[PDB]
Amino acid sequence: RYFFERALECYKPFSDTVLLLPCTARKPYLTSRTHRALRSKVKVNVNEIIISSPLVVPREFELLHWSEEEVSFVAGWLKRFIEKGGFRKVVAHVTGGYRKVVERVEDEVEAEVVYTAEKDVLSDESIERLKQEIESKGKVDLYRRILEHMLSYQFGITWSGKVAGRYPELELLEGKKRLARVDRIYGMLDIYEKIAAYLLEKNIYTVEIGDFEVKGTIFAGGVLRADEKIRPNDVVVFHNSRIFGVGLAAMSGKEMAGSGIAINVKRKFS
Numbered sequence: 001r002y003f004f005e006r007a008l009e010c011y012k013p014f015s016d017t018v019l020l021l022p023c024t025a026r027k028p029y030l031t032s033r034t035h036r037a038l039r040s041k042v043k044v045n046v047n048e049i050i051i052s053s054p055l056v057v058p059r060e061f062e063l064l065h066w067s068e069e070e071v072s073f074v075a076g077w078l079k080r081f082i083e084k085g086g087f088r089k090v091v092a093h094v095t096g097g098y099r100k101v102v103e104r105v106e107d108e109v110e111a112e113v114v115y116t117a118e119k120d121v122l123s124d125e126s127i128e129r130l131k132q133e134i135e136s137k138g139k140v141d142l143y144r145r146i147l148e149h150m151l152s153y154q155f156g157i158t159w160s161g162k163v164a165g166r167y168p169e170l171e172l173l174e175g176k177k178r179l180a181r182v183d184r185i186y187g188m189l190d191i192y193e194k195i196a197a198y199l200l201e202k203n204i205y206t207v208e209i210g211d212f213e214v215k216g217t218i219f220a221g222g223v224l225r226a227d228e229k230i231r232p233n234d235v236v237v238f239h240n241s242r243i244f245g246v247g248l249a250a251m252s253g254k255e256m257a258g259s260g261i262a263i264n265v266k267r268k269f270s
Contacts, residue, residue, distance in 0.1 A: 003055070003061075003064070003167075004011060004055075004056075004077055004080075004241060006153055007057075007058065007061045007064075007153065008080055008081065008084055010149060010152040010156075011060070011084050011085060011149075011151045012049065012149070012152075013047045013080060013085040013086070013087065013169075014140060014145060015045065015046040015047045015087075015140075016086075016087060016088045016089065017046040017047070017087060017088070017089045017090075017133075017134060018046060018047040018048070018049055018082065018085060018087045018089070018090055018091070018100060018132060019044065019046050019047065019048045019049070019092060019093060020048075020049050020051055020091065020092045020094055020098075021035065021038070021048060021049070021050050021051065021076075021093055021094065021121075022034070022048075022050070022051060022093075022094045022095075022121060023050050023051060023052030023053075023055075023057075023097055027062075027107035028062045028063050029050050029057070029062050030059070030061070030167060030168070031167065031168060033157075034121065034122065035116055036075065036121055037150060038093075038122065038127075038130075041127045042127055042130055042131050042134070043136065043139070044134070045121050045134070045137075045138065045139060045140050045177060046091070046134050047059070047085065047087070049081055049082075050062065050078065051074065051076065051078060051094060051098050051101055051102075051252060052072055052074075053066075053070055053136060054070070054073060054074065054076055056077040056078045056087075057083055058149075058151075059142070059146070060145050060148075060149035061149060061150075061153065061214075062144050062146070063146060063168055063170075063187065064150060064187055064188060065097070065099075066097030066100060066101070071100050071101050071104060072083075072104070073102050074101050075104035075105050076103075078101060078102070078105055079104075079108055079109060081107060082109055083109060086188060087111050088111055088112065089111055089112045089113075089114065089133075090102070090105075090106075090109070090111045090112070090114070091114055091116055091130070091133045091134055092113060092114065092115045092116065092117075093117050093126070093130055094117060094121065095117050095118065095119060095120070095121060098193055098204045099115065102115075107183065108235050110129070111251060114133055114137045116129040116130045116133055117129070117130075123130040124158060128171060133213055141163070141164045142209050143167065143170055143236045144163050146170065147170055147189070148182070150182075150188070150189045151180065151189060151195075154188060154189055154234070154235060155191075155195075155199060155204070155205060155235075156204070157198070157199070157200075157202075159172065159179060159180070159195060161173055161174040162174070163181050163206060164177035165181070165182075167231050168182055168184060169184060170181055170182045174194065177192070177193070177194075178192055179191070179192055179194055179195055180192065180195060181259070186196070186233070186248070188235065189235070190231075190235070190246070190266065191235060191246055192267075193269055196237045196244065196245070196246050196269070197244070197269075199215065199237045200237050200239055202224050204227060204229075205227055205229070205230060205234065205235065205236050205237055206226075206227055206235070206236065206237050206238070206239065207223055207225070207226040207227065207236050207238045207239070207249075207253070207256060207263065208223070208224040208225045208226070208238075208239060208240065208261075209222050209223055209224060209228065209238050209240050210222045210223075210224060211222075211239065211240050212240075214238075214243065214245060214265055214268055215265070216264075216265055217261055217263070217264065217265065218247065218261075218262050218263040218265060219239060219260070219261060219262055220251065220255065220256055220258075220259075220260055220261075220262040222262070223257060223262050223263075224257075225257055226253040226254075226257045226262075227253045228252075228253045228254055228257075228258070229253055230249050230252060230253030231253070232250060232251060232252060233248060233249065233251055233254055233255070234248070235247070235248060235249075236247045236249045236253075236263060237249075238265075242270070243268050243270055244268070244269055245265060245266070245268030245269060246265075246266045246267050247263040247264055247265045247266050247269055248263065248266065248267075249262070250262055250263060250264060251265055
């Protein structure tokens, strides 16, 4: 519910066309054999949305029996992303139950909806139909959009830098230091000094703490004030008169400044 709503407000397309694809057994979806084979036979320069259940997932957030109720629920969310994205065309490269989901949305959106797959999403006929619908001139840096979207999702900000690492372990670098990196364990971005510094400045996702030596844990009693918008598993930036750091909130911003373990410390800067 939270994922859906937050991703929807942070969703920013770079194309007027969106490609719909089937979810896969292996995740994150971009590393699956099907998605790799597809992107291998056709240069994809339009936005992508992976249809799954119950999750509808724009490719940019992929790192964070089709009953009536299920088709209805998935169609509802898929429609939201299509309309929020303001696409002029929707290319549905999916089959069976997935087409039923898309078929539900087609009748409610202004966008043109074309179907390019019948039986096999990877057949020579399907890839030719697909190419004829999304063929594009140059290229797009999908990795940068993904990292930018995760920053937006988690902190409501964006940042520039060099994109590095092997997918899905991407990083954003500035100078010769990392600004952020994908944490495959927690499925979110870990941030470093410059960003945490920026968040501290704008006083967002910040928590003021007592003047004690920080070591691993910060209990609620050690928290002076905290951003009320802070939710449990959120990355927060704590600080006092001598240091500031990065950690994982264990409780809401309300519980901290209220009345257990408040933050699991990842690192700190002098």
